Design a protein around this ligand. Structure first.
Ligand SMILES: COc1ccc(C2=NO[C@@]3(CCC(=O)NC3=O)C2)c(OC)c1OC
Ligand SMILES: [Zn+2]
Length: 102
């Protein structure tokens, strides 16, 4: 029901806050460093620290710019905040295997 940071237990999100972006909350993507992530889209998240300004470079989601999302408590990379788009304007893409569910 609740998602916490797997490393430290920081409160991050909720199953209720999952967002089906393009018809599915789960998107399997790879970055240019060939790292594969199972990304769960959330309308809402808390307890993160968004670092830097947004970038569109290699964005997996058309029309959205990303900011790196760390755990605000432990600094572990938990995913990205997406902004600059439409329906919705913003959302979170969190790496499922870096969260723990209650
Ligand atoms: C030009 O320098 C980079 C900028 C962004 C990234 C990204 N890695 O993950 C990102 C972030 C989130 C996203 O929507 N898609 C990706 O692919 C961008 C990158 O790879 C490590 C870079 O090294 C080449
Ligand atoms: Zn943490």
């Amino acid at each position: 029901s609740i998602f916490r940071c797997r490393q430290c237990g920081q409160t991050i999100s909720r199953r209720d806050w999952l967002l089906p972006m393009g018809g599915d909350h789960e998107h399997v993507v790879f970055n240019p460093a060939g790292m594969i992530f199972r990304v769960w889209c959330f309308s809402l998240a808390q307890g993160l620290r968004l670092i830097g300004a947004p970038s569109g470079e290699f964005s997996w989601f058309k029309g959205y710019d990303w900011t790196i999302a760390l755990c605000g408590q432990c600094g572990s990379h938990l995913g990205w905040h997406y902004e600059g788009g439409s329906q919705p304007q913003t959302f979170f893409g969190l790496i499922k295997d870096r969260l723990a569910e209650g």
